[model samples]
Structure formats: C-alpha cells, structure tokens
Target chain A: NHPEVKIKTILSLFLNINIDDFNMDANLADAYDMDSTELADLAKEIEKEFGISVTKSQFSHWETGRAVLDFVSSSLND
Target chain B: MSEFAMVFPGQGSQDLGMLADLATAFPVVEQTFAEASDVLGYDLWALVQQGPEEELNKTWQTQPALLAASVAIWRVWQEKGGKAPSLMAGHSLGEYSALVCAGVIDFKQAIRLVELRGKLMQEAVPEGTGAMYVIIGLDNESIDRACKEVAQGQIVSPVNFNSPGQVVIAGEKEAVERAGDACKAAGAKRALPLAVSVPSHCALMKPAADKLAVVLEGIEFGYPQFPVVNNVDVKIEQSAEAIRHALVRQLYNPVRWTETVEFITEQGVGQLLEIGPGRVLTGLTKRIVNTLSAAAVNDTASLITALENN
Candidate 1:
C-alpha cells in the first residue's frame, strides 16, 4: 500500500538484489553497482508511473532507496 | 495452436555460468559448445563454465560464446520436442545465431564468421577510442538529431533502435559523451555507457563490414528453414545474396529491433520466445509489443514453463 512497495518492485527489475534485501540507506551505485544504464531506465519507469520528471544531475542526489522514496513522495504531493 | 516467434539475445546476455543448469539435463548444451570449440581451437565450455572473467569478456570470445550458447539452446528445444517458432529474429550478434538455427548457414561456418566478425570490429576501432551509450526515454528522431548536431565531422549516431524509447548510440569516445549529454538535454531520462570495447553497428564499423564482405563471399548460404527477420531491414529475406548483404550491412547499420518485433507481431504471431542465455529479449519484447505473450527458455525450469505454456 505504501510508496516503498512500489519503488522496491521497480528497482527489483533492474538490480540483481532481492526485494527483501533492499535497504533504504544503502548506496545504489556503490553497493549495488546500479550503473547509468539501470538508473536511466529506473528514472523513466518512475516517471511513467508518477508523472514526475527526473533529470541526469538529480541521479547523483538520490543514491539511496530512502532518497528515492522521499523524492517520489514530494513529487507526487507537488 | 497460436503461432510464436523466436528471438536471440546478443553480447550483453552472456554470463560465466549461463546454461549450466540446462546442461545438466540436456547434453545438447555442451555438445553445441564442443562443436564450436573444435572450430575455435579452444575449450570454450571450460572458459564459459569457469571464466577468468576477463578472457571470456573479450569481444572475439564473447561473440562465438554467445552464438554457441544460443544455438545450443535451440538444439535443446528441438530435443524437447518443442513446437517450431513461426518466425525468428536476433539482436546484432544474435542475428547470426538465428540464421544458424534457421539453416541459413552451417553452424561451423557461423562460429568462425562471428569470431572473425568480432576481431574485425575490434580492429576497426582503437581501444578506448570509441564508445556506445544507451539513451532512455527518447524518440529515435530526436536522438538522431542530437547525434547529427554534435557529430561535427565525427562519427556519432544512433545504432540500436532497441525498443520504443530505448536507443543505443555509438561513435568516437568524445563524440559519444557529447551525444549522451545532448540526448539528456533533449529530454532523455538517462544516458548510460555500455561495457563494450568497440562501437558496433555504426559508421565506425564500416571498415569491419568491408572486411567481412570478403569472408562472406566464400561461404555459401541456404534459404532459411523458418522465416527469419533480419536486423538491418526487418524483412524476411529468402535469397542467399540478400541474406549475405544483410549480414554485412548489419555490422554498420542500426539494429531495428522495435520494428522487427512489430513486423513479427504483424505476421499474426501470438507469442515471442527468447531462445538464448538471458531474459533480455523477453523483456524487450514486452516493451515492444504488450499484447503478445513473451517467454525466455534458459534452464530446465524455464524450458519446462515455456513448453507447458506453448
């Protein structure tokens, strides 16, 4: 029911990490090796669902699962 | 019975332990690699089973390895008594695998041709000098415009029309970077660099294609047993001359995967089956055509699932 569940489901598609292992504070790029290719598709998928626009520079800012959830929360609210 | 189309994956689908589980249940997996080894003069099965990671990743090794893996899976499908696919298409290097399975050429000749194709492509571009980037959430026309705007006499352009919103661009390293930035500026969600040594399927591969033309001339091609869609034109070519030309041009032209899938769907195919090492083409098939059912057969479980569903 929460946005956390939706975000985790999307991230699971790109990352080899299991859904249960998703940590909110873990660095996606450093710890999970979430490279640019994955990030681009992830951002687009997020955008498609939430109607929020994510830019390249913003990718560096939201490196953790919690940060991504927060961005989606704020974007959906706005 | 609903008709189905078969698709093969290209370079990025490979892994160190691909088809290991399937090999346990079916001898065709290793048998296929063994035949390739005899042609390649190396124990490909050993390298794939226990990769140093670095050696198996080299383009020359990766191309033949993937070809053998795809063909091996096709052999397994036949052994399992799976129904034949009505149409077949592959992405880039995978197209050769499709051709081989469709009986366009001898498997031995394909093994050698793809190996040499890899070497020629690598030799065409110097190391660290060329790059390919996947541009997401962008239209092909806009991506092409961005590449053309930034080319400035350098070779930078969209090479792979993979899906509706995903296009891969390749060219000189600096040009690739510039094109990536331009694509992002033009509303691309992300521009990610691919882990490949050579910028394939672009004008930079023209030299490779030219060299490949000579080798292709000596090899005889037969009409495919099953209708096969080519990457260059997304057409089911039956003539040997046309098939040869398509193979040569495929090296330097963009992979029209989206249209290829659409063309297959138009042929009244109700399903798309990825007959290779990974779920890449299966995933892309969903993006390309939502109405069609998509499945990937990589191991025993997946193979069983596909056969049952089919």
Candidate 2:
C-alpha cells in the first residue's frame, strides 16, 4: 500500500473520521472534533510513523486532512 | 571576499508607525507601499503609516504588511547601491521576505502568499483556544519534557527551536499555562505568553500546512539568486523545488534557527545583517554565533551606518 494511503487510514482512525470521507477537501479539524489535545496526539502519531519530530508549532497550523497528509508525506521523503 | 548573511524577523514584532522614520528618509519607501498596495489590492501604507493600532495587528494584514515594509527597507538599501550578501535567511514568516529579496519569488507573489499564509494559520486553531509561550533560560530537551509533563493530555510542546535556552512552546491556552508553571518548577528564568493568534511552529499548524501546500502548487518557483538557509532543515536550500517543499512543510516544522545559525557559521559567514524592524534576529545571532558581528537595519540611519561600517 502507498505511504499516503497508510497515513490516511491511521489519520482516519486517530481522528475518528471515516476513511471514505477523507477526501482532499475535507477539513480535518472538523472531522476529528479537533482541539489542541487531538492535534498533539496526531503529531505524536506522525512522529512515531515517520521518525521525524513534529512540534506543537506544526500542529497548531494543520487545517485539513490533506495538510496533515502532505506534511507526513514530505517528512517521510526527507 | 567579504561574506555576510541577512536575516529577516517575523510577526508580533510590528508596531504602529514602524515605517514612519524610514518613509521620511527615502522615496523608495513610498514606492514600495504603492507597489504592495497594487499587488495586494489594499492601502498597505495606510495600515502601516496611519493605523488604528487594532487593524494593523490582524494576522492576515500583519504578515503582508510586515513583508512589504521589510522589502521596502531592503529596496531602499539596494537603491543606495548596496551589494548582495553571501547568504539570506529569516525567522519564521520573515523567510518569505528573504526569499523575495533573494529573487526566488517576486514581490507580488511574496505579498499574496504571506496573506494566505497568515489567514490559514489564523484559522487552523479556534480563536483564543490556542496560545504560545516563550521559555527563556531553558534547553529544548528540558522545556520539551517540562511541557509534556505539565500538558497531561492537553497538547503542549516546544515549537520554535530558536536558540540555546530559548525555546517557545505552544498549544491550548490551559496547557500553555500549565507549562508555564512547569517551567517555573524546572528553574526557568521566565515563561511568558506571547501575543499571537495561533501557536505557530507546532503540530497545531498542520491544517495551515495542508492549505498552504495546495496554494503553493499554484505558484511557480525559481532558483534563489543567493543561497537561502531554510528553517525546517537548517540547511542551505539546494534548489527552487527544494526550497518550495521545505517552505510548505515549514508551516508545521520546528524553526531550527539555532541549527541554521550554526550551519551558516560553519560555512564561514563572518557578518550577519538583520534586515527587518527589530533587533531580535541580531540578538539571536549574537547568542548563536558569538564570534561573528551582527547588526540590524530597519531605518535610514541604520542603513547608512551599516554601509559606513562595511
């Protein structure tokens, strides 16, 4: 499976949003009932998956699922 | 072979009448305002020159307004036949200004991107729920552990890897407050809340990063005329594509400024010039690279002084 796909699944589970609804336009914040707490969890998850450090500053600006996906993808690439 | 590095400062450093002194001394200042107004479709100079104080501080307005003012100052220095530095960089949002000056992006594109960048960053966190705090006199590892222990489950973490003993943490307001107490317990000199809309440089900025990625795809990039040390990796950006990629990810990445300064110093940069409003970057540079000379140029007098000293 693709890395982004795996990330999408993990994000779906973490945020408690349906995988099917994880479209590009979907606002991850709305889907996850996101607050600062949830964002921190998501950052840790991404860090665990990619072995790259994700900070509070990074989580504070994540607006959508696509944003999170892009961030994870890029970090993985690096 | 006189090699110098230029650093630009980011947000929360703006003030009412910041450019008043510069405008009085240089026509290049007015020209910069006109160009930015035409690019952003608003009276930028009015916001910077004659402000109600409240309006000038909005994230969307503040980012672009500061970029315009910084670039205006850069242009005035250029008009006086200033030579290019060996390297260029910026702190946080000021990176956009550095890129613009380095010719990686045009002025109009820089203004537009910063406008969107500010809006998306503002919207990522709910109003007033998120906050940032500066932890002075504490190392990154210590502050990180302190914030994590205090956050309990509330999501506090270090964001700005600014310099030695000066990491800034961000998260929910309550979590930040908790972290402040923890900092006190950990023997921190000061842990103070910063006046920013959203906690920047943390995981909380992921949404803004996603939005910015799509926005970035629509834009084009060119090779920087000068080497730009990026905030995400703290390394010299090797290409236009690499710079753009790092910039988009930088929205949700640690600033790595201390590392960047170290990297530049290792590369033999002897002098650092901060080309923005405050002396914050200069101060940080001094802390990071104590052996190098650092100066800030935000007004007419400073610009002349910098040239004279050079």
Candidate 3:
C-alpha cells in the first residue's frame, strides 16, 4: 500500500499524471536512466509494509507506471 | 656455454610454510629468522610459519620475511661452495635481495628498507580503490595502448613489463577493469586481476616513491660486488648512488623485466637460477630466453639440486 502511495506521491510530485498514462513497452529505454531499479527495491519495502510477496523479477520488469499498477493490483487480489 | 646468472623472486611469493624444511635442514635458517625477527622487532618466523594468513601476507611483513628466507637459502648455497653467477637480477621486490646478495648493502639494511618499501606501497593507495591486472599474451606496447585508451579519469599504465607477452597493469579498480576488457578485446589471451591492494609500478605509487626516496637517501650503499641489473633501468648498475636512485624511481616506473633479462642474456648468461619463493620469475624468464637453462631454488632440496648442477 505504501508503494502504491509512494508511486502516487511520485506521480503527483512530478505532475498530476495518472498511473495509466505510462506505456511499459514505450518506456523501456527510459527505464535505464532513473534509479528505476528502486521500483523493485520499493516493492520489497512495500512488501514488508503489507506483509506480502513481491518477486524480484516482477519489480525488475515493471518498466512503466501501468506495469507497476498491474503488479500491485494482482498482489492485492492475492 | 652454461654460464650462470643468479636471480630472486619478488612479492606475493611468501607463504606461511616456505622455509620450514630449510629451517629443519640448516640451523643457519633458524638463526636467520631470529635475526630478522630482532631487526624487525616482530615474530617474523612465526608469521612465516604459522600465519593468520592476512597478517603474514601484509606487504611489510612479507617483504622482510621473504628476504630473510631467501638470504638463508643463499647462505646455504654459499656453504656448499656454489659458484656465484656472473650477473644478478631480481624481480620487482626481489631487487633488494639482489642488492644484499651483491654486497652493495648489508642484509639488515636491505630488510629494513624493504619493510619500509612494502609499508609505503601499502599505505599509498586505499583499499578497494587501487588494483593490478596481468595482461597475458599481449606485448607491452599493445597493453599500454589499450590502457591509455580506456583509463578514463583514473591512472592506468603497464607496471610489470615482465616478458614479451606478459605485462601487468596497475591503477584504479574501474580503470584497471576497463583496461582488462580492452586487452581482452585487443586479442590478448587473457587479462586477469591480480590480488593486490596497491597499484604498484604506476602513477598511483608516486606518493610511495616520494616517501621511499627520503628513506633511501639516508642509507649507505657500496658498489655491488657483481653487476646488478635494475628493474627500472634494465641496465647494469654499479654505483651505490645510481642503485639508490633506481630504487626510488622503480616504485612508479614499470618493471622492465624483459629488457633486464635481454641485457643479462646479451652478457652471455646461459644458466639462470631463481633464488626465493615462487617460480614466477623463472617462468617468465623461460619465455624470454627459451634456449637458456633456468631453475628455481627456494627450499633445501632445490638448493641442493642447484648446487649439484652448478
């Protein structure tokens, strides 16, 4: 939940862009720049917050905002 | 045709149990170790015999310890009436051993200077920042070219120009790694990292060299009894002043081992004997002069064999 909250905060901080605005395939190159690896790191941090499993690969491939949202949605369902 | 040349091995060759057999075979070795311990004011033999590994492996400890072991082995060789070589050479740190053997400096002074040498080299570079790499199957020129091209902001240069195909590079870790990759891409057989803390024989050692110069200036050196080829100059050095100067310059200068061997061979040295720990220098010399006969004498058995052959 904190990861979702943090992502929301990040999106809000950058601009009011929604999580749905990002396209995973299109943003793959950009993923190389940002400490985007922090997404997985944040996911692990969020896992500790919510007491759930966030696999390393899931975080690694979460290129765009949509991909991260989808991952969080699945984890919530689980 | 089998004229002899006496040589010595350098750092990274010392071990916890190197002179164990020698000490058992000769009381002089025990006395030698005791003398070294007293000179160093530490249990050098204990470190050389039963190491916690890391302490014994420290450059300062290993330098004096290895020198003591080599000199003990040398004395044994002398007791057996072994013929002295026409020329003498030492690899890197082994140069001090050569000086002692040549009687340019006494054993105690050589031991103390090498202790200081190793300490200064260790302290010059911080841990994990400096590194050394062995670029095999590439000549010094190509290795130098590759290192210069990829060094980025860090200092990178060929350190040990050991033989035709073996040149060791030293500098910052990232720069050294980049140089290794470049060497591999440049058709070298292999470019491997060396397990060393300091980037020796490179610009990173300038501080160490500067400190060593002060120590070297105070020491007295006499003319060598035999012609001693210096690692930095790759030429015969007779004067004490020239030898001292070479020792200072040698810290940051690349070890011209190949050129030194070439010069010695040109002087008609056919039998090359490597006296000390590790067969590394002898191995390199074999590549340099394939036709010349060479052997490594580090223990009682090897010393006995070299004596019989000599």
Candidate 4:
C-alpha cells in the first residue's frame, strides 16, 4: 500500500524471491544478499525514479522491504 | 583396496538456495555456514539462502561462501559415517575445502584465508584489466602456442586445463582477448570470454599470491590425513610443506584437473563424489574417465542418493 512503485520494481527484479511468502522480520542485507555494489545500483535507480539523491552510507537505513517502503513513501510524497 | 575420491568445486558453483535442501536434511548445513559468517563478519547463510544473485556472485563473497558450503556438505557426509576418500582434490578455491576435509587446516582459518584471498585478488588488478576465456576444441600445443604468442608483452596462458577439448585462459585483459582471438583463428570451436571479476591462476595474481604467502606464513598446516592432489602439478602432496607451498604456487599456477583425474583413475578410484554446490566437477569427471561412477551431492535428495548408492 505504501511506496509500492519503484521499490517493488527493484525488489522484484533484483530480489526475485516470492513476496507472497515474504517475512519482513528477516535481515534485508543478508536476505537479499544485498552488497554495497548492488546497494549502489539500487541507489542509482532510486535517484532516477524519484529524482531524489540518497548517499551511499544512508542506504543502510533502507535496510529491508518494509524499511525501504518507509524511505520511498516519505521521499516520494515530499 | 576399494578406492574412492572426493572432488570440490569453486567459484561459479555457488547459487541461491544452494544448500537449502541440505539444511532441511541435515541441520549441519546451515550450522556450517553460520560458523563461516561469524568469522567473515557477514551473513553467509542469508546470502546463500536469499541471494540477490549479484552479491553472491561477487568474487570476495563467492570464495568464502563456497568454502563454507563445500565444507558443510563434507561435514554432513562424515556425520552419516561415510568413509573418507583415498585421495581428495579441489579446483582453485575448492582446494581449501579439500584441505579442511583432509584435516590439513582448521575450517575456520580457511574461512578467513579465502575471504582475504578473494578481496586481495580483486584488489591486485584493476577491474576489467584482467579476463578469462574458455577455448573450446583446441589441442594443448596450439593453445599453449596461442597463449605464448599473445604473451609477447603481457601474460596470457591456460589456467584451467579442464578437459580434452577445453582449456581456460586468463591474464591481462587485452592479452586474454588477443589469445582468445588467436585460438579461434587456429580453428578452435569457440573462444568465448568469461564474465569473471578477477583473472585467477595467472601472473596477474602474483601480488595476491605474495600477500597470501605472508598470511599463510603465520598460519600452520598439518599433514593431510589423506593424500591431496594439488593443482599446480597434479601430484599427491601429504607433507605440510608441500601443501603450504602448493597453496601459494596455486595462486599463479594452472589447475591440472585433467591430469589430476587421470591420477585418481590410475590409482583405482572406482567412484567420484563431488561434495559441493554444483555439478561442474561431476561433469568433468565423467568426461575424463567414462567408466567411473560420478555424482554430485549438494542437496537432500542427492545426499540421500549418494549415501544409499555408495
């Protein structure tokens, strides 16, 4: 219901795991095998999609599927 | 003597859910990866289970993850009271796994060593400055000559002498590309470029090998409980000195897999068990000796089958 656009787009593509059986409590970094490189790649796409800049260090806060939702929802609205 | 051999895969063998089935069948699978994650300071199991695919594919992550996975499966095999092989061998990074199985090195040291090995390898050469190629359908002499021809000013040579028709070449990116073209020009079936992050088993790894030597110096190696067929020369090394030297030289020397298989077969190895993620070694063993039974066990079904059949 929140920030389902660009966030889901990247998650669906890069994190090809099924969302129906998704558990939000999992560690996003380990769950998605998300390394700094992929994080940077996701950050780039976020900038292009939302026209919002997120630094490399700050991407850690967009840590999980749910947390990423919060970041995108707040950023996209403002 | 009823002889058997164990082979381990390296690098490209790792994939998402690699040992998921094994985790279900034997809790030790996940437990092994957890041990590796502790020393690695990262989530090894989480990546293996839920890989973004890209992260798991990184050379740094790949080395330690595969080390853990191979040792994990090896540990499970022992838990089932399976017999240790008459001899063991591993491809590149897989060598560390074999060492762990042989009791030559503690599994934890191997976990840290490979993580550093991978990172140093990636750091040694600028990204894209090094590359590898699989030259299909070429004779050893022709491939050697092609690599020699391309090595006029830069390093390019066969790293993985995999099978009869295939040889993997790696070195400076331009030299590797040039040699691939040369191999193709010499009527090779194909000289396809490999999408590798680091050009392993070549002169480009000299610096990485040098650094590895320092690390290995501090660490101790014990005599393998079983003979280990090392990559550089395909000789069965039992003493600690040979094993330690092999590791350093292996960083730059080519993996003599074809010869290694022949040595195993010659020694009456009736069957080959690949205890790691992929079936690459199983497939190669099949091609090398058509008569011997070859199987890979990375999941529950395969593990059950391997134990039942063997």
For every candidate, give the share of true A-B contacts it also has.
0.20, 0.00, 0.00, 0.00
Best by TM-score: 1
Cα-based TM-score, every candidate: 0.82, 0.77, 0.77, 0.77
Model 3 lDDT tens row, B1-310: 4679888887766656887877888888888888878889988888877887577666777789879977888888887788878998888878888889889888987878888888788888877877777777777778889988997778988888877887888898998898899998988866756555577788888898999988988988888888888898887777777888898898888888888888888988878888887566766776888887777787778888888987
Mark the 10 consecutive residues where model 3 chain A has the least summed lDDT: A28-37
In candidate 4, what are the lDDT values of residues B130-244, reduced to their tens digit?
8887777789899999989878788888889888877899999888888898998998866756556799999889888999888888888987787888889888777777777
- Candidate 4 residue spans exceeding 4 A from truth: A1-78
Off by over 4 Å in 2: A1-78
Writing each residue's lDDT as its tens digit, candidate 3 over A1-78 gives 456566555543443356566334445324433332234335655565556676433455555666666766777778
- DockQ, candidate 1, comes to 0.14
Question: Which number leads on lDDT?
Answer: 1
lDDT tens digits, residue span B1-310, model 1: 6898889998767777889999999988999999999999999999998997567767899999999999998998898798888999999888899999999999999999989888999899987899888888888899989999999999998889888888889999999999899999999877877667689998889999999999999998988899989999988899899999999999998899999999998889999888898667776776788788787888999899888877
Question: Per-residue lDDT of B277-309 in model 2, one digit per residue for the tens?
Answer: 755677677667678888779887788888776
Clashes of each: 0, 31, 0, 0
| Candidate 4 DockQ vs. native | 0.02
User: Which residue runs does candidate 3 get wrong by more than 4 Å?
Assistant: A1-78
lDDT of 1 by residue, A1-78 (tens): 389989888887667668888777788866886654466577778887888877543543567888888988988788
